[PDB]
Amino acid sequence: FRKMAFPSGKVEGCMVQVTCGTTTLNGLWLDDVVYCPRHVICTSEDILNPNYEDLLIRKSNHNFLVQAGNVQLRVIGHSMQNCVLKLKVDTANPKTPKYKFVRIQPGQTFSVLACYNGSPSGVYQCAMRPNFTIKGSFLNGSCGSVGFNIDYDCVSFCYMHHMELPTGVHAGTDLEGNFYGPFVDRQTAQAAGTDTTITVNVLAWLYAAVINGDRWFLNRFTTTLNDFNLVAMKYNYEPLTQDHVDILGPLSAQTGIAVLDMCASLKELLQNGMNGRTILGSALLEDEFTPFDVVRQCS
Amino acid sequence: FRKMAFPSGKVEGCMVQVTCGTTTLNGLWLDDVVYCPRHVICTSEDILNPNYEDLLIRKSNHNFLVQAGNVQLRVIGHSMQNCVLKLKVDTANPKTPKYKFVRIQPGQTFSVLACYNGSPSGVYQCAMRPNFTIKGSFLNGSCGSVGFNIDYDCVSFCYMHHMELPTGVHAGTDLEGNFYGPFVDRQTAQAAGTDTTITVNVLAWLYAAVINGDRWFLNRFTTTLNDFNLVAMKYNYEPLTQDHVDILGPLSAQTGIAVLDMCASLKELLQNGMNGRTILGSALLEDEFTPFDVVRQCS
Ligand SMILES: COc1cccc2[nH]c(C(=O)N[C@@H](CC(C)C)C(=O)N[C@@H](C[C@@H]3CCNC3=O)C(=O)COP(=O)(O)O)cc12
Ligand SMILES: COc1cccc2[nH]c(C(=O)N[C@@H](CC(C)C)C(=O)N[C@@H](C[C@@H]3CCNC3=O)C(=O)COP(=O)(O)O)cc12
Numbered sequence: 086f087r088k089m090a091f092p093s094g095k096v097e098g099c100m101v102q103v104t105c106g107t108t109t110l111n112g113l114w115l116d117d118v119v120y121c122p123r124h125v126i127c128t129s130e131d132i133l134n135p136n137y138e139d140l141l142i143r144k145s146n147h148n149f150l151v152q153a154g155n156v157q158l159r160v161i162g163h164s165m166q167n168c169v170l171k172l173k174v175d176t177a178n179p180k181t182p183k184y185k186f187v188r189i190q191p192g193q194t195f196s197v198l199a200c201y202n203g204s205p206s207g208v209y210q211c212a213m214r215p216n217f218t219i220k221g222s223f224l225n226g227s228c229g230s231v232g233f234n235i236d237y238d239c240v241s242f243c244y245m246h247h248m249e250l251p252t253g254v255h256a257g258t259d260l261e262g263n264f265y266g267p268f269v270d271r272q273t274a275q276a277a278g279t280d281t282t283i284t285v286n287v288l289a290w291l292y293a294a295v296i297n298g299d300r301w302f303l304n305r306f307t308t309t310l311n312d313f314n315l316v317a318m319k320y321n322y323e324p325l326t327q328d329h330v331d332i333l334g335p336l337s338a339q340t341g342i343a344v345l346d347m348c349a350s351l352k353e354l355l356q357n358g359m360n361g362r363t364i365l366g367s368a369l370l371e372d373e374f375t376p377f378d379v380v381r382q383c384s
Numbered sequence: 385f386r387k388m389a390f391p392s393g394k395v396e397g398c399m400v401q402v403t404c405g406t407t408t409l410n411g412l413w414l415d416d417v418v419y420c421p422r423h424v425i426c427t428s429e430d431i432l433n434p435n436y437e438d439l440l441i442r443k444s445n446h447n448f449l450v451q452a453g454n455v456q457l458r459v460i461g462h463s464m465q466n467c468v469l470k471l472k473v474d475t476a477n478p479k480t481p482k483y484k485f486v487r488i489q490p491g492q493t494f495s496v497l498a499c500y501n502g503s504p505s506g507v508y509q510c511a512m513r514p515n516f517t518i519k520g521s522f523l524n525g526s527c528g529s530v531g532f533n534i535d536y537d538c539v540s541f542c543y544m545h546h547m548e549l550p551t552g553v554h555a556g557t558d559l560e561g562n563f564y565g566p567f568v569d570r571q572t573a574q575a576a577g578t579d580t581t582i583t584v585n586v587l588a589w590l591y592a593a594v595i596n597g598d599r600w601f602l603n604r605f606t607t608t609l610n611d612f613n614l615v616a617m618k619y620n621y622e623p624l625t626q627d628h629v630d631i632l633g634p635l636s637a638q639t640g641i642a643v644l645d646m647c648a649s650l651k652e653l654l655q656n657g658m659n660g661r662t663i664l665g666s667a668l669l670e671d672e673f674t675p676f677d678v679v680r681q682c683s
Binding site: 086087088089090091092093094095097098198199205206207208209220221222224297298366368382383384 | 386387388389390392393397497498504505506519520521523552666667668680681683
């Protein structure tokens with residue numbers, strides 16, 4: 086049981102390279118539109134406090150150079166939706182999969198296709214933390230890389246990458262240009278709210294540990310939902326809802342461990358620690374696996 | 385720092401399914417040849433102790449159903465190479481990338497595209513252990529899934545999946561059909577050799593830490609290679625090779641820390657312990673990042 090990303094071929098066929106002036110980043114080419122972060126129009130001066138509608142009315146179609154591999158697409162239009170620039174081109178991408186723009190909830194996961202200069206570099210799995218950051222791996226030139234899920238040949242795009250906080254975590258927008266969290270596309274050191282642990286995902290990952298024949302953390306005891314949430318909130322874990330309990334049903338049915346039983350296990354793990362032992366190789370409680378993540382891998 | 389797979393699109397376009405009787409597994413379609421595990425020709429009463437040579441003589445080209453999606457590709461030739469079947473087909477795969485077949489060393493990492501009935505399911509990075517096993521995530525129907533590295537648009541295929549040992553780790557061959565490690569393609573419980581820690585990768589991980597300003601573990605001593613290797617084996621660490629010293633070159637030059645000085649630093653860490661202090665946020669030493677992996681995620 087490992088962190089597993091969706092195959093990235095369908096998104097790879099859409100990554101292009103967008104240049105305005107002296108700056109370059111990645112864009113997403115679907116049908117005849119290219120989507121990219123709008124601060125690609127900005128200069129070193131502008132970046133500190135950009136008045137984007139002002140900067141954009143002064144740009145022309147010919148100020149944008151879009152490259153798909155070695156061929157250049159001609160831009161025939163440009164508009165701005167929140168933080169994303171939409172560049173119309175005179176060519177439809179034949180590799181455009183069935184797709185949808187969606188806004189992810191905190192706790193949900195997606196695959197990130199890291200790109201540099203319109204070339205895909207790597208793929209890995211991330212979760213939207215409760216404080217609307219993600220713990221990614223991105224360098225200079227990765228802006229415009231997207232996050233996505235795949236559901237029966239439909240690619241749901243949910244993330245476009247914009248910045249790296251001083252603490253080394255990452256921030257970005259949905260494909261409608263709206264940031265996840267309180268961040269802004271201006272060149273400033275920004276801080277996020279206090280992060281908390283995704284409780285439903287820790288539980289799913291304990292269930293995963295048992296599906297793979299590991300059980301040392303189990304115990305005989307049980308807890309009520311409310312009493313687990315009291316201890317949980319004490320340790321900066323998100324609350325567990327009855328919806329979460331329902332979602333975990335399959336995992337409980339498969340292993341024969343009721344949810345509130347597994348909660349009693351996690352409570353004791355929080356109150357006492359791991360005592361040097363490890364779960365699925367990890368020395369810390371993992372919270373970047375959704376219950377759907379677990380079932381899809383184990384079956 | 386994240387475990388990061390290569391983008392999987394060039395390999396996705398090469399995945400097909402190969403059916404003999406009622407057993408279906410995955411195959412790899414490059415130019416006009418399909419590669420797959422030979423035990424696809426086995427019946428459930430044959431897998432215990434197959435006579436592959438005798439089994440193959442009774443097979444004809446029309447006993448083999450090769451499908452890209454639900455589209456059939458006609459088999460026009462067949463032959464066996466160690467444990468892989470090679471099926472010549474009547475169509476050259478137009479999505480064939482520039483490619484190589486290569487045999488990796490323990491410690492090297494690679495990306496696995498987990499496939500079922502010729503359809504990609506997921507992608508993740510594995511390291512080849514010193515006992516020639518990989519810590520995979522595979523279900524029934526996964527045999528013939530391949531592992532690969534991509535360097536400058538050329539795909540180097542290094543693994544084809546065959547087996548899950550009773551301990552839950554996995555085993556397979558290179559693309560010429562030679563098993564990694566002492567295993568055989570028969571339906572029997574086989575045991576891996578005792579595993580050890582991949583020393584070259586731990587050192588890579590120490591260089592990563594230094595690059596990020598975490599360097600308390602650096603010391604004023606050096607060692608000879610042989611002296612380090614003798615000590616390393618007493619701690620269940622792999623001995624260093626001359627090639628290992630060579631692939632630490634870039635990290636050594638970038639940090640100004642000589643390889644044998646970093647060995648002396650690691651050697652003190654083995655004799656004395658971490659004393660509660662951490663490295664890159666952790667109390668255990670990571671051994672599944674290669675020196676190329678570190679260079680990739682730092683630059
Ligand atoms: C003084 O201000 C600061 C103080 C302290 C911390 C700070 N952090 C940022 C920031 O992150 N700024 C965004 C651009 C703003 C305008 C939204 C950025 O730099 N994004 C990168 C991806 C980043 C690059 C490194 N790792 C990534 O993930 C692009 O890809 C585009 O820029 P490039 O063309 O590649 O250089 C500003 C800042
Ligand atoms: C009774 O003997 C045993 C005792 C104890 C442990 C044992 N383990 C194996 C084994 O692994 N046997 C190979 C068959 C070959 C080696 C002849 C196999 O089962 N390979 C799977 C991949 C596996 C499936 C689950 N997770 C994977 O990685 C395929 O994909 C092909 O088989 P399928 O037709 O797809 O089911 C036999 C065995």
